[PDB]
Design a protein around this ligand. Sequence first.
Ligand SMILES: COc1ncc(-c2ccc3c(Nc4cccc(C(=O)O)c4)c(S(N)(=O)=O)cnc3c2)c(OC)n1
Ligand SMILES: COc1ncc(-c2ccc3c(Nc4cccc(C(=O)O)c4)c(S(N)(=O)=O)cnc3c2)c(OC)n1
Ligand SMILES: COc1ncc(-c2ccc3c(Nc4cccc(C(=O)O)c4)c(S(N)(=O)=O)cnc3c2)c(OC)n1
Ligand SMILES: COc1ncc(-c2ccc3c(Nc4cccc(C(=O)O)c4)c(S(N)(=O)=O)cnc3c2)c(OC)n1
Lengths: 332, 332, 332, 331
Amino acid sequence: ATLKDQLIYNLLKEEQTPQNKITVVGVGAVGMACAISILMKDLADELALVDVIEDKLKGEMMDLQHGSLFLRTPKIVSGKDYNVTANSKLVIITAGARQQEGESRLNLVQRNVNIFKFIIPNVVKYSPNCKLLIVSNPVDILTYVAWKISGFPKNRVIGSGCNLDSARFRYLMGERLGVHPLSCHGWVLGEHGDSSVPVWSGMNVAGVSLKTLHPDLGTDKDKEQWKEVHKQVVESAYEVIKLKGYTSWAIGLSVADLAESIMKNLRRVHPVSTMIKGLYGIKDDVFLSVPCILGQNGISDLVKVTLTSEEEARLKKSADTLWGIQKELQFH
Amino acid sequence: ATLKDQLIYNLLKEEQTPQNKITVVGVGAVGMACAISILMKDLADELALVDVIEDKLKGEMMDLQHGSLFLRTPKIVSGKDYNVTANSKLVIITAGARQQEGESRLNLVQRNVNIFKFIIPNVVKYSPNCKLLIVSNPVDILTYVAWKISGFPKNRVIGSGCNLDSARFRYLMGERLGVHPLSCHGWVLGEHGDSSVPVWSGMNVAGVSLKTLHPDLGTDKDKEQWKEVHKQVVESAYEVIKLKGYTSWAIGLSVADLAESIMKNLRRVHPVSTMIKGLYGIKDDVFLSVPCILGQNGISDLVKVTLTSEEEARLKKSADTLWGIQKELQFH
Amino acid sequence: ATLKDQLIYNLLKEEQTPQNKITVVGVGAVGMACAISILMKDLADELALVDVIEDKLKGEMMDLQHGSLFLRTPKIVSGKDYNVTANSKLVIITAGARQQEGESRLNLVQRNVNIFKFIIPNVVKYSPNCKLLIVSNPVDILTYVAWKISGFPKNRVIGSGCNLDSARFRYLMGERLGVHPLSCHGWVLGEHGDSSVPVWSGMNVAGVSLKTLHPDLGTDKDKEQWKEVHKQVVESAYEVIKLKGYTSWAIGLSVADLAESIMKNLRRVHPVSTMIKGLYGIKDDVFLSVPCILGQNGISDLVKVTLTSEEEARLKKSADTLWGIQKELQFH
Amino acid sequence: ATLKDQLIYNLLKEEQTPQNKITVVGVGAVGMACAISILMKDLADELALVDVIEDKLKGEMMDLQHGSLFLRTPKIVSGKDYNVTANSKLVIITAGARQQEGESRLNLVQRNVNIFKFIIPNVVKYSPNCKLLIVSNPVDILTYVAWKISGFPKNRVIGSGCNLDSARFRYLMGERLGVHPLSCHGWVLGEHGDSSVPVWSGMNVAGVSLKTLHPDLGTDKDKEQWKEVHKQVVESAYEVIKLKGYTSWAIGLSVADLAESIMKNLRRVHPVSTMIKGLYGIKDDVFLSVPCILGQNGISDLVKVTLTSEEEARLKKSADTLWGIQKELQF
Ligand SMILES: COc1ncc(-c2ccc3c(Nc4cccc(C(=O)O)c4)c(S(N)(=O)=O)cnc3c2)c(OC)n1
Ligand SMILES: COc1ncc(-c2ccc3c(Nc4cccc(C(=O)O)c4)c(S(N)(=O)=O)cnc3c2)c(OC)n1
Ligand SMILES: COc1ncc(-c2ccc3c(Nc4cccc(C(=O)O)c4)c(S(N)(=O)=O)cnc3c2)c(OC)n1
Ligand SMILES: COc1ncc(-c2ccc3c(Nc4cccc(C(=O)O)c4)c(S(N)(=O)=O)cnc3c2)c(OC)n1
């Protein structure tokens, strides 16, 4: 006469093939920041955590599990084996190779490719219809890798791209103008990293172009040196790592926001990393960050931003560089 | 004129006194997990971080700031100087001594005393009307310590106590019964730790006493061994720490929940650590966890839970140990 | 081409199929209150409204649409035709007959049945796998009716039952005690309306039985007349209606809560109207409120509250009243 | 020993002012839509309702209170007496007179003046440091009227103005583009209603300007007739009132949104009605919607939009019009 049976009359066996499942792969600082941000935004009804560090994984699962009372996400699960990711709508990849000391860039990427050779086909094995959000760096290359390896079409392979950079850019713009980042508008596009392009033309508060008001905006002869806002944006992770060891919170919140649009089919515009063969004269299979319309089918549409000859040329060289690295990769 | 000034006409520069300020002291895993939990429950319009480790501190402030666009808490600040804590409604203390192994428990607590000797007066100096929430372990003792130093009335010196213990209990009650923990009710009370008391009489679902349904509940002769549920509660922070190195997420979510009741004046009942001289035949100046009505002035009232003789003894022995340590502390 | 085509490049013209769609039938005060509350708890990616009064339905739909910028439900539709309700996960029925002075209680029910005879098969035509949440009054009878007409299994046909009854009961308990209704616990069960049963035995705060503490709780020799609290609960709708005309807000919030559990698979326990044939010595196909576990499959399990024979007699009496009314109803 | 004696040990009370109190005046559809939206965005620890029908008031207070368990706002109060409003941080005024069939524009705003002479003094009496948010129409004038009667600094007297007009604009712009309104940007400014101004130059998505991409946009010759997006915004309340009797939900959300900025000090930029004597030729004490920075002190700063001479003219004509009415008023 077990106590559960005395208390509760069961009415229904049925399995629970879950309806709004998100999986996070990799439980480091970035991964778990993505996890807590997702849980606290009530975006998913089952969350799956996957890593190879078995004891650390289990710790992070239990710790979240213990906060269940303060959450609205009834099922939290974890494991090294990818069957715990089955039927995910969205799979967020934070996993990668850790940096070796004298290691060439290619080699770092190659070793990420070797890891993705194992992860990605396990992810598609269990969630054939999911969306892949790649966070792992270098993100515009690793999004190409997940694309190639998965074979998913381009709308369901998304890189976190410059989504965060644009966030930092707005924060900083805000703190100059004394106005909330929500009301300060501006776009960092192209390659996530040192070569990202701050589109000055597009910066506005309430539709009032900063570029028109201050024509020297973004340039050398700019006496307010607004390019330092960009320099800050690019330097930002470095300085944060220099200070606290890693970064986590910002990238967590940023990925949670991309998930919001996807999981709730919002059709919001985010600058994320997407295939752009065809656009800006770029002829290579290369992912770059461009404002995209995000929804239940991933990237459904993208926004053709008017770019200058100068800004177009930046994007083209980012692609040249990326391809140069991408064509020395080994997938077999 | 500047760009700022061609774009924005200022009507009044005028001083901000902040209106719902929360300060968090100590930016290790526990402290930051409280800070992210609070940012995401929009409980505060200003969040101040304080620690002595300046690199870590600036790093965390910058990282949170960088996700501002995704938050509705417009000012985040930090510093080693408690002037940044000014006019806080609530001050959460996670700071403490690093354990030294060898160390007697007494000496460990005395070093915490000496830290609080510096911290607590600075806090009250800058936010004389705040509520203090102590999270630092050993929490039932350190809440007494903060009270004796602050000279605040007991209603505004609150230990996080068995709030999380009780959430763990309910999560576990939950996975056994197949019901969300929000709907599983049971209270861990008394000393936060080994000696905590699981009040079986109070364990219910939909107001059905489990103890009346299965009288063996919480006894050696219990066939379903529900006593193991309490054992898992007692040992979770050990099991999680052993597995992932620290604990953070559950405590953060837990402490944000206390902060919600305080900041929004809800007068909900949480089991937190407070002065119980008088209750359950306790004669000494001891804090322990009892269900308390939390609101804008902190603890307004406490619930007189009926305990068995056995439970009342467990609790009294608890206060006797707590007093055995406290009577050996050095304040002046 | 056009502006849209110049701005936005399209990767993908899109299947549709909304993933978390909710339909509200009837756009009176109760329906719109349910709708606004659902929209503000970010529970659905598509909201569909259905009434017979065309101008009203379109005006409300437009009004909601114009707040789209402050919400997160990208698609809001309406129509006379149930084709706007396709692929709903939850269809919430508020529709019913307007009372006519001097009409018997039976003819009122029948007229409601003639409506359901049109509505229910349309709801299943287009959402064969939805859950039905009936709100229309009399709720326990009209739940049975929807159950019969739909042919759905019983787990997927739910009446709002004594859900709000117990909210009001908790609110009142709260005023008396000085404590948020969240921390006061009490269940009103059975037939929604004059014969509902306040289960004194289960009333607690912090898991302390008010009944044990105050043995006369709920009797006529009760010095504190706690019996009045239930009478307040039973009579509140009348009293609000008398003051403002209808009730709307509290019912809407109570419906949004039940959707939250269903749409998010929470498995929280709510006192809702379900089929209790086989309990409390009841052999008739009858629906009454009893505490139920709500999830993505609707009512998966239910709680067996222990009732005193007085309490058990009221449920049995209601089961006879209801059936003697139901056996007279006309459908097939 | 009561039950309460047996169950609750009580501690020495300390006193309690409410910390984030919002008052809403007038509990027709618009008042209550504002009330439920504020309740559901956890913006206050206390909500006060005030009107003149005691029955409707007590009913809406009870019906709300009954859903307390599902909310995080622990005190809801109502009454004809303005002391239920004491210590409000923000007072939202939806009260006013319905224009009657045979009634001029001058007598309407004069009746509203007289009603405001009763309400506003009472509001400042019990809550002298509040921000007033005027929602009542004709709003750009009544905002001016609240200002005059309260004697508040211009920063604490805010009119809802084109905050909803802009949101409707963005919804409609959204429908055409297949993009959510959050990501669609366009601003409606000036006198609320038929004479509002849609700033076509500022319309964008991800910072790509629509007017540069499609120079006819908003002119008549425009083959896609984008001008009708604004015309729709102008005739939306009319079209909805026609269809359901009134407008409530949209305005309610719009107002909560302004309330979120004020109550949480966000310094977000909302097109709201403010005293813009000094800009655009305007040399009169007139309130029109400009984009404004809203925080805890109300309107701290404002954005100087670059306007066409034609857009400038519409504002200036509005300002004349309004002063032409305000000068006949008597306080
Ligand atoms: C043959 O089966 C197979 N199993 C696991 C993996 C594999 C490897 C690394 C992973 C990997 N990272 C990892 C593991 C070990 C060393 C290093 C390093 O710094 O070089 C990096 C992760 S991660 N980043 O922890 O989420 C998650 N999953 C991983 C899975 C694999 O890939 C090469 N192949
Ligand atoms: C009166 O001068 C004075 N100033 C600061 C402190 C003082 C000491 C430790 C603090 C202290 N902790 C502490 C001490 C020693 C080592 C470590 C560590 O993390 O490794 C940490 C903290 S905190 N928040 O835990 O980081 C915060 N504030 C502190 C302040 C003090 O107490 C000794 N006395
Ligand atoms: C088979 O054809 C058919 N079409 C529509 C209806 C029908 C009737 C009332 C509805 C009905 N109520 C209604 C309509 C007209 C009069 C009255 C009254 O009793 O005063 C009540 C609703 S409603 N407003 O959403 O509750 C929604 N849908 C309804 C649909 C129907 O019902 C018998 N049958
Ligand atoms: C001098 O005493 C005095 N008491 C109340 C009022 C007064 C008037 C209208 C109010 C008023 N409007 C109102 C009241 C009665 C009738 C009508 C109508 O046009 O049919 C309009 C409201 S309101 N709009 O309901 O929130 C709220 N409070 C009001 C208060 C007053 O104004 C002249 N003067």
